[PDB]
Amino acid sequence: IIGGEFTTIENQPWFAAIYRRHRGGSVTYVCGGSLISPCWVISATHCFIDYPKKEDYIVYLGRSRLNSNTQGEMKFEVENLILHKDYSADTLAHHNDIALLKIRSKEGRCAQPSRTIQTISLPSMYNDPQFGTSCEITGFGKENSTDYLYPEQLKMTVVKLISHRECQQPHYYGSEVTTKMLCAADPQWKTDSCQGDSGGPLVCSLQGRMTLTGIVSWGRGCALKDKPGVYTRVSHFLPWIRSHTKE
Numbered sequence: 360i361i362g363g364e365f366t367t368i369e370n371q372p373w374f375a376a377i378y379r380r381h382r383g384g385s386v387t388y389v390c391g392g393s394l395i396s397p398c399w400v401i402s403a404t405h406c407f408i409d410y411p412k413k414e415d416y417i418v419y420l421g422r423s424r425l426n427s428n429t430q431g432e433m434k435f436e437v438e439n440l441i442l443h444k445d446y447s448a449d450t451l452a453h454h455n456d457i458a459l460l461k462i463r464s465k466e467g468r469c470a471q472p473s474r475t476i477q478t479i480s481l482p483s484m485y486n487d488p489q490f491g492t493s494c495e496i497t498g499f500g501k502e503n504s505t506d507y508l509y510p511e512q513l514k515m516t517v518v519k520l521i522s523h524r525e526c527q528q529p530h531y532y533g534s535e536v537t538t539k540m541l542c543a544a545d546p547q548w549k550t551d552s553c554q555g556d557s558g559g560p561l562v563c564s565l566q567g568r569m570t571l572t573g574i575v576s577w578g579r580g581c582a583l584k585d586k587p588g589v590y591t592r593v594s595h596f597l598p599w600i601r602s603h604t605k606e
């Protein structure tokens with residue numbers, strides 16, 4: 360997250376941190392995620408497409424730090440990795456960038472709700488926040504594009520939702536951005552999500568209820584003028600989300 364402020368998981372209880380195991384012992388960070396149900400975490404397919412093995416992944420809940428433990432944190436295995444069948448990646452745009460991770464501890468149990476581990480609500484069919492509304496994004500992504508390391512402490516920021524008309528502009532993203540995507544950016548282009556925040560939540564207060572409006576998907580650079588962060592419009596994937604979570 361470029362700019363913004365540092366925070367704790369107590370403020371982002373639904374945040375999931377996803378790591379990938381490696382041949383040997385190293386465990387690098389992959390992407391963020393959001394707990395939508397005790398046994399389900401939603402993220403971005405682009406984060407896993409190259410390594411479809413569910414065994415190489417580790418999901419953390421109630422974790423505020425990148426390389427260290429947090430009291431009350433929970434470690435999970437990926438019981439099932441569901442990638443969207445129609446995912447594709449063009450020059451900049453990443454289509455159907457959504458994924459589901461059924462998690463399970465070593466005991467075979469799911470996420471036990473606590474003060475540091477809560478599930479965030481999904482939106483109603485096509486019911487999204489009106490454009491110009493403030494929403495938050497969380498992650499362990501880069502603080503500057505020049506950085507090659509992720510910040511140890513969890514970061515967050517507020518961005519404003521941008522209409523499909525403004526984002527579809529020539530100097531913005533042209534026709535690359537579709538109706539299945541949302542644009543959000545700082546009106547001053549000072550704060551934005553960046554490499555590493557992918558798969559993380561874009562939460563909006565919809566009708567007095569915290570909702571998972573989008574998933575950090577793509578964007579040209581980080582916090583560049585007229586280059587908003589593009590998010591997967593969670594409200595257009597409800598059917599897909601429901602059919603794959605049932606059984």
Ligand SMILES: CC(C)c1cc(C(C)C)c(S(=O)(=O)N[C@@H](Cc2cccc(C(=N)N)c2)C(=O)N2CCN(C(=O)CCN)CC2)c(C(C)C)c1
Nearest residue numbers: 405448451551552553554576577578579580581582587588
């Ligand atoms: C993969 C490669 C072609 C590549 C593509 C791109 C974009 C043009 C899509 C970049 S960027 O800074 O402009 N963008 C990176 C980082 C990013 C992510 C999410 C949101 C923002 C935002 N502005 N708010 C920025 C990115 O989109 N992604 C998502 C795509 N991704 C993948 O690996 C997809 C794998 N199929 C890399 C990180 C990079 C950086 C290393 C310079 C590398």
